[PDB]
Amino acid sequence: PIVQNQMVHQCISPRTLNAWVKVVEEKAFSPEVIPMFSALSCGATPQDLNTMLNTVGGHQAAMQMLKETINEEAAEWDRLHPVHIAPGQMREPRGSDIAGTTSTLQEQIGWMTHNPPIPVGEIYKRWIILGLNKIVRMYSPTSILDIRQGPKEPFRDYVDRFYKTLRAEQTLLVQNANPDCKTILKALGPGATLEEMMTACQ
Amino acid sequence: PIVQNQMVHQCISPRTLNAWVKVVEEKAFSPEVIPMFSALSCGATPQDLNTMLNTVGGHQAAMQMLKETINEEAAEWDRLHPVHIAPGQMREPRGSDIAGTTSTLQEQIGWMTHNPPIPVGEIYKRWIILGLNKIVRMYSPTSILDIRQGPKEPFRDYVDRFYKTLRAEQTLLVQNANPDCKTILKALGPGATLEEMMTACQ
Amino acid sequence: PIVQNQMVHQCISPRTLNAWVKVVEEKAFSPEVIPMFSALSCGATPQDLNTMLNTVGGHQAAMQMLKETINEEAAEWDRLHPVHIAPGQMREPRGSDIAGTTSTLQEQIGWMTHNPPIPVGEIYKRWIILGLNKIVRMYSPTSILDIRQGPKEPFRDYVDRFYKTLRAEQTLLVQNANPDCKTILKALGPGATLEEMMTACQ
Amino acid sequence: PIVQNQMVHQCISPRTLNAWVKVVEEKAFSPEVIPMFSALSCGATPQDLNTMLNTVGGHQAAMQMLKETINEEAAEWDRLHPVHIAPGQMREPRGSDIAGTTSTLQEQIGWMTHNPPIPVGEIYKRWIILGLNKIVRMYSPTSILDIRQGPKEPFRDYVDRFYKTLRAEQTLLVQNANPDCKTILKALGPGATLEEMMTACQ
Amino acid sequence: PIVQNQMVHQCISPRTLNAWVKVVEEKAFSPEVIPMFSALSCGATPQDLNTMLNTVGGHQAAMQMLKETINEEAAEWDRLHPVHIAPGQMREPRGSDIAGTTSTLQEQIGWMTHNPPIPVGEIYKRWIILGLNKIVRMYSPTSILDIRQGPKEPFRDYVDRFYKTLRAEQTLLVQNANPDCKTILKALGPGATLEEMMTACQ
Amino acid sequence: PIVQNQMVHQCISPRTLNAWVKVVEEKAFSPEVIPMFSALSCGATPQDLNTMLNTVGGHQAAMQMLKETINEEAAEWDRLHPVHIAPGQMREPRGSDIAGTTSTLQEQIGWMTHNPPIPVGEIYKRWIILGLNKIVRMYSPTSILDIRQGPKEPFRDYVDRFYKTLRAEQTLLVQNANPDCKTILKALGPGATLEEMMTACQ
């Protein structure tokens, strides 16, 4: 990553490397993996981002879908930012330089610490996150339409399932509630907060 | 977070990230989670606070109740602090900027390290804590009225249950004691400290 | 805590937070918990001390006895140090400011780094330790009078039990020894060191 | 490694040492070991690279194949960069100096921090990585031609196996799919992305 | 401890605290605990040394024997260094100040960072180590005279037991060897190294 | 160790201490322990080297063989570097000073940070490593002549055993291969690389 000493390059830590590999191993593509990715890659260069993605051993279908989204984003970058070199001067990054496949670490550092910065790390991160969100959505196993409260399922447990599903996938809460709770919730009227719904079906 | 070097931004550490996720996994919304949240988010920016909340994988009913409390606090902020920009100048934060959904990290840093500081991290933290306290109270499973000393339950064990319940929920200690201990405690008279009660029913 | 860079404030570390919670979980109020508390709270502000106490999830009988001892110490402080403010000047701490319930972190820092310092962290720590020692003594399960050497119990094992009990609770060693060892120890005469006693009953 | 303070030498950390040994123990020569090697050896001197390789206890067939590839790369270096010393001056590195077998740590440091640098650490790392890629390929147990979708195997599971194999080893995806999915995929037409294939056989 | 920034005081780390408690829990008073104690207390003040000793929960017979040895060493210090104060000046340490029971942390720091230093931490450490060596010797369960090679016990295993015993306790190696190995060893003649003995009875 | 701030002394870390003790516990004197020793003792003083050796609890036969090799190396040092003191001047180290048994930490530091340095830490380390290599060789359980490929043993598994043995101990690879693989390997002709042998007997 690049952090403050000046803005300097630091090696990615074993701690970070291991945190990410273990998140992926334990959580696969549950939606909460994405903010963890984002936070573990704070200050990442593109080289660091590729490290993190490359150190994942399974899920190679997902990793190939990700390469696809990256190549689409990189093609769109190049459409909007065609590149035209001057000895000792900073060249303009192309999509593949942002994605770290045709740029050196030194180039990456030169862009990211330029004044003003060309934040290649943050641009690449957004393309990766875009890819990862597609993957989360792909691997979401259940439609929110199939999350319905069981006859002895506590409302709270049902709400947990409901919003967990909506998170991966992205009135009905009441519609999908069991008969007894639905009756209570209908009687609460419109404008009830979630808190008030949950208290009423407790 | 922002800490002293100057007040500088530092990446959230894997240690912190993992500590918080593991607290939530092991303790759910026992009341002791709140001071742990507070201490793990020392110096947090709003971006860091969202990271911590976003990395929680379960409990999405609670996470949605929290969003509600945040949006109420943010609406009250905006009622009290309407915003009116000057090139290169610091804009005034709105509720959604404090909550980190419409402000950049750079803006956040600019507010929090301003002289005088606009402590958006601490303001957001208070809204989050307000939400989390509601959640603790919601998930408290037992009324203090139902904590009563068993006939062979050691007084100390009963007192532990009593104050654990009162903590989640927020004379009777004596009223709820078993017959034998209640007699002893009545004889102690008013003004007995807890220490003296516990020694008397040992 | 406040440590040297100047004396600066630093966030409490996840390491410290977790160490303390795990000590309490594994050791409850064995006497060795107290020096561990003391060492983990090195440089603590009152806010940090409250963090550490607040992050404990069980033992709420003990935590309430502790609040009592704190309020007594704070009432005695106020009796000895009544407080009489000048714009931009440092106010004098009251008991509740020392205990961190009515003082801000900034006030705490201002007292503790004043020249000369008003060491609110160290004063509060002593009140806490006073409370914790009462708790250790309360939860000590056995009178030293009931620690007696078993007929086949190795002397060393008996001495361990004896001094472990005396530590929680706070001639007889010989009196409480078994017949065979007592005879040997009586023959050693007065002035024997513990080492010499232990060697004689080996 | 050499990192920024100046570019200074730092001892390899126990954390790094243990991370690498544990990667190798758990993952052997799965392809994801290589980027982990690369990232754990960030800033490595040749001495550090030899440390990391030497601390591996098993896999000595692989370690000897690696020595072979290193000696070939070192022989090619010497062919392209023959060496011709001046008291107190920096000598030119030979292959065996790059590989750290005939150079001291001090020499290594002198090359790597020279202006301009003679990046012996990065040159050696590339030879090692070249060797490790041969080893990954050797130990790849399955031809991509033998990865075929089972009749009840979910497409996603089959794609994972397919790209995992291709990664170790380095139209057919459709050819190797089961009859039912192959029919769907043929109907999608050419130019389908992987995402669209995976959605169609879901 | 006191370490270099100036010589400054630093809080004892949770890492150190936990390392020591775990050594004692796992190893009791095997002789190898002593060098670990020494290395974990590098730069320790007397306050730190007391912390480390006080955080041990079991072994209170040993801890009381240690207090005895400390009080003897402290009495001998006072015999050799009687103390005779000048406002704002450094007083001379007595035994009990060296052992940290009557000296403050500030006094300790003032002695240890004086020019020239009065190394109270190192003096106390030597008294502690003296005590701990007595304890190691006390708890050594076996005389070296009872370590004899079994008829099918590998020589190496026997030598391990022999020198392990001698270490706790502090020609015969040959005398205590089994008949077959003793014959071989007698034939080797005098002046054989241990290496040569071990090779001969392999 | 001594590392860069100036070259300053730093305490050995609990991390290092524990890493070494655990390596020895898990790996005994497999050859890979030696490079781990070397890397964990980077910058070690002789005092640190003795710490590391002294903290090992088992293997006291090996530890005594090591003392022997050290005393031989130290006797050879003294033969080549006899010592002839000037108030406030640096004395010349004898073998026993290099091995840290008759030199103080301060002396050690004075030698190692002298300009030019008298690298007592590196000299002692080489004597230790010399000893440890003898120990590795002693405890190597099998002659390379007894490593022969089983009739259903995969060639790769056999090569692993072969080079693992050669490493502890320090044409035949083909001679010791099973009949079927030996035939293939004979047909490959001379000059085959290990890679080509392994591919041919796959």
Ligand SMILES: Cc1cn([C@H]2C[C@H](N=[N+]=[N-])[C@@H](COP(=O)(O)OP(=O)(O)OP(=O)(O)O)O2)c(=O)[nH]c1=O
């Ligand atoms: C002793 C022991 C530790 N662990 C883990 C628990 C801990 N997880 N986290 N932290 C690790 C210790 O690594 P940790 O102390 O976190 O080291 P690091 O992350 O490098 O931080 P620093 O060195 O303090 O700067 O080992 C275990 O799983 N089982 C065990 O028996």
